[PDB]
Design a protein around this ligand. Sequence first.
Ligand SMILES: Nc1nc2c(ncn2[C@@H]2O[C@H](COP(=O)(O)OP(=O)(O)OP(=O)(O)O)[C@@H](O)[C@H]2O)c(=O)[nH]1
Ligand SMILES: Nc1nc2c(ncn2[C@@H]2O[C@H](COP(=O)(O)OP(=O)(O)O)[C@@H](O)[C@H]2O)c(=O)[nH]1
Ligand SMILES: [Mg+2]
Lengths: 442, 430, 226, 238
Amino acid sequence: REAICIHIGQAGCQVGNACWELFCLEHGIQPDGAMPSDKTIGVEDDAFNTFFSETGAGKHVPRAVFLDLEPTVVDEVRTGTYRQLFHPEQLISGKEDAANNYARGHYTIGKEIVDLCLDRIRKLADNCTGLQGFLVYHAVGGGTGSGLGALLLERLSVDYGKKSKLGYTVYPSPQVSTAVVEPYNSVLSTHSLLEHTDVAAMLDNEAIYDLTRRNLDIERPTYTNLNRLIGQVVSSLTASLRFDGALNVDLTEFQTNLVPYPRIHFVLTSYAPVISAEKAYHEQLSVSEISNAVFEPASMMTKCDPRHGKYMACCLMYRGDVVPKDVNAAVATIKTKRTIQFVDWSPTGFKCGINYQPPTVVPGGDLAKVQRAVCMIANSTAIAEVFARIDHKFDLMYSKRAFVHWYVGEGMEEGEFSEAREDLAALEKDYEEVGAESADMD
Amino acid sequence: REIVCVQAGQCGNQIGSKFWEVISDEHGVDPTGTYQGDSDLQLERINVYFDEATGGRYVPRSVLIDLEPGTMDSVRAGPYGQIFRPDNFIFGQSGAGNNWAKGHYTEGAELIDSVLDVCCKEAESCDCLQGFQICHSLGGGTGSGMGTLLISKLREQYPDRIMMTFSIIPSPKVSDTVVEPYNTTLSVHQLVENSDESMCIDNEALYDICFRTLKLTTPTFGDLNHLVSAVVSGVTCCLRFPGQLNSDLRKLAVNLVPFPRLHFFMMGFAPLTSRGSQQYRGLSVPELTQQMFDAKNMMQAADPRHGRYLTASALFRGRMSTKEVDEQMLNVQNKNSSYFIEWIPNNIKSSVCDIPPKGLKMAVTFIGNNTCIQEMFRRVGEQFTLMFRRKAFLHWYTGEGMDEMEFTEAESNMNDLVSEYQQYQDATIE
Amino acid sequence: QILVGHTGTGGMTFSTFKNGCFGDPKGPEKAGAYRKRVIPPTEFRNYYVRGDLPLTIQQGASRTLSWRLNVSSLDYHHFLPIFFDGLRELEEPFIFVALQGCYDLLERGGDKILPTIPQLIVPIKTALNTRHPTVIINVLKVLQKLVESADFVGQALVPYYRQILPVFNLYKNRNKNIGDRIDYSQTKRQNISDLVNETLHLLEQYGGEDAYINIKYMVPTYESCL
Amino acid sequence: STIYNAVDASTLNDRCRTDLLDTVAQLGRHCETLPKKAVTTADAPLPSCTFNTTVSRSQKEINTYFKDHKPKFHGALRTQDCFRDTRDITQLSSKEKDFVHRYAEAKMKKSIPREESDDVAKKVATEAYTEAFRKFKGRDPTEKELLEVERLYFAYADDGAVGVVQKPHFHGPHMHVSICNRKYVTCPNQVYRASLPAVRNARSRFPGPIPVWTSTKNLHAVASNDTYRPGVHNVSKF
Ligand SMILES: Nc1nc2c(ncn2[C@@H]2O[C@H](COP(=O)(O)OP(=O)(O)OP(=O)(O)O)[C@@H](O)[C@H]2O)c(=O)[nH]1
Ligand SMILES: Nc1nc2c(ncn2[C@@H]2O[C@H](COP(=O)(O)OP(=O)(O)O)[C@@H](O)[C@H]2O)c(=O)[nH]1
Ligand SMILES: [Mg+2]
């Protein structure tokens, strides 16, 4: 039933702002936390419970923490429109950033703030009766997102144990770039995400820019568009928990169906009707068309082409007015395709979900209003190509020790570069080996 | 002579809801629980499925079990849900996750004592108890694991009664879950030891019934569960109404099972025909018999023409001559004689009951014991072998605690079941 | 336990295979009143070890007791309760000293035994609660000596039957039936039940004019002797 | 519950108990001796990351009985033919072989001597044909007229005569209909040994398991989708 969202650093807080805007507007909670008396929701209803708790006077408050080392973004949240919605204890801010150093966040600065984060998260977890995982939003390119995200995932994994941790991560884009030191932070980051996450979803800003230029008709996109798309995706994935449907899918079903081996937990994500209002009225939108859409690489939110690898498992979430015959016909058509290939050890490649609540539309010009949508999470060996470009950039920089004195000065051994690069190399070799056909019976 | 039903998981709860709709309609029970029927023949056997509550009321002798309450709000929301006794709902707080080991070992052993307590409370109230009836899917998680757990406990506690199961099995084409082969194989291993008679259904055959025979434009799981509720309520009809040649579940078992491992049966129900076509064909015993043996109207993907009938049974409802029933069963046995095992001189049992279901002049339900059921199991075993050689998802089951030896035992037992059926499918050279 | 194939009862059902309570059929756990209890430590040990008792163990040819002061001049109000507290001991040399001390103080106590009756009630009631047969026999013999020691002693013990008699009820009907065989336990007075009956008879005899009502009140089976 | 414990707790007598147990034992033995496929096993050179365990999931983990009986009936009808046992269904028919030889003769544009064999059936058939030809016409038949033996079918009669089956019946089950309808698996008019033809699955027919609803010009109709897979049907004559 309940899930708690943890937002770290700049990207994670801004995406959290867009997400909570969406979840408020879909349930109908006023920005003051109340609910107007003219709505037909009913006082008794419970669907909000996944994301809000009431104090008993009927105000709503959300199950989230916002974590940052610089004040500016959280003070922006504090002075914005949702000021009265959040409890002030939930908005935690340090004094100064981790300055794009993973070492500064992990060793020097995050160590001071981390115990406050655990005390607030504990205060949330004590006010639950069916917590079924943590959702984490961060970028691995920056210093505090990498360092405090890793440290916090380690501490959470010791303290909470078996509870599931699902990550949405903004990875360094393959040719769009914002800072020089992105490869070092991403390599050092991937070791912690490897050990301390149950499923990891990969996002690239260059892909969401491509999707908003190509599919939407936006000449001048900004981060709010990308964050609204991410919010729509999370709302689609959690809708299966919150509303009635023909074939429900509990959050444990994603991990059970999608993950074949305990290390093979990095997944590709895509969303079908990313379409503008003018295009949406030019096209019919049947179940099979959006199912065909989620498999085109032009639809993906991570910059990888799945045609260079093999799928192991797919999980398809349908929400809205959909009928099982269309889901079955679509999956059989996908299976028919020749450019879509599954590993021969995974014959039953698909998991389905069907929910009656159509996706909510948030005021503005970034998505049409539609009666049905499908969202996909899939595990594929193609992801090894995504890591290879970071490793090439790391090798280029590390060949001259271009910046290492900063990292060594803030507390890290030089050995950690070689260790992390060898561990990510082993992850590539794992994806090479798992994708090798079973030619042992010859 | 009272039957106790067990309904498990979402599929089981939905099929059960449709079953209790069909039975309450046939016996004229109002959704308030009030008797509103129009003949004494309805009242005189109401005890078979209903218990009597004070001043008029009737309560249905059924136990509802599931591991997450999501389903409970759907069944509670159904048209008859209020009728059910509150104490009969036993539920947990988190789902089975479609994992057999979780459903069998952690929440299974946690809840099972309260389910066994309810089943014993219900059984000891009957003046004479007939067999149990269970509906569940074999491909799921809580259905397979906890259903077979409960079956094992009831077989320990009631070894002299009959144990009958209706079971849903995964289509090779209509997949919904990646780990279906493991759950199916382990559940079939449990059933072949535990069950006395088991009927197996694939959703693909019910879908083909709906599309080809009924020509439904937009079928839903409610139609499939209506077909299932029709056959389940039909098999028991001779238990609870008068007739010229009465029959009983034990007599069906005695005539159907030649050897104790050969207890897996196919089902069919004959008067299915679309509303446009119905003006074109009247009901008659030859027509019912022809549809009854037509594989289009049969609820499994295996076809009888690829196997042989060991035995079959037909139960007729309605006012009809016995001569036509006997001569039809002789004519069908004679005309298709190559498909019947030759060392048994007569393979078909007939039964005749006076009271048809409301609004039909006549109906028949068909139970068949044919070796072509072996084809489904080889297919499931193939997908299992593809998955098992590579340890594709095995770490989930081993992390719960299962030994790989359970998987090798279950595979060996199913393979021996397939072999035993396979020897009887092909006749000797002579 | 795992399910091995080819061993189930599948397809083999026969009527021949046939197999309102608020508590478990085994019944409640026993809490026996005859079980022995722990022995609390006594002040007699401390008084003997420190050396406040005016007596010595004279060895000679056999163990006796010698007193530095004549017995008739001691302060019974102080001394008598400690000796009665020594009846609870079980190991040497405390038991011999306590028993011989109580006997030879009761032998020549005089007219001062009567005022110190209420002080001896607590040692008596705490000795009998131990449910150890040896101290029970010892305290029963001590009571038999005490009742006939001086005048008016028995009439003072009538109000205190409430604190002494509950132990007596356990061992009043426990004699062994050996038929025609002869009993050799009579020589050393090691039987408990006969001692209980004799003590009850003596207590009623010396009680006065209303001891029977109280003894009957506290021992239901008892019937009068006079 | 195990069968042994159930029998021990049952209320049978000793003889029925031991008979039941022995029947179960013989059924198990016959199941064991019946040869079909064996259990599967894992491969030897499995790669890595199939045994390694992530720390998060490490925290997750909890740490002869059967008898043969052929009772013959006196005076039973004949159900086999000497001529029938020689032919094979898979090989092309004798008329087809004659056409193949005539095809070769036409292609080469010259006569080709026929193959010679010492089969008894050919000799018997030629003897009978010559006798009947001499009966009908008072001449011995010419070698060109003896080529009819290849085209026709031959079979014995009940009294030992040799004749020709004019209208052969299908070698599978078929119907001889009279005042009553009857089906015959084998009949004297069949020219090949009895066998059961193979049929397709009932649920892999022209529309798939889930058809798509389309329309004609002005009526509703049905069509197939990817759930329908046509058969291979890779076979050709000659
Ligand atoms: N999609 C999306 N990406 C963002 C957003 N903000 C920053 N990014 C990207 O994330 C990377 C920068 O990471 P930051 O979040 O700024 O790093 P940080 O967590 O603030 O770490 P510090 O600089 O030490 O405070 C760049 O690739 C940015 O393009 C955002 O709001 N949405
Ligand atoms: N006929 C029928 N099949 C169902 C129903 N609900 C689910 N299924 C099928 O059963 C399989 C899912 O198994 P499920 O019932 O969810 O297993 P469970 O979670 O243990 O109860 C899929 O093949 C579904 O299509 C139903 O109401 N009727
Ligand atoms: Mg920052």
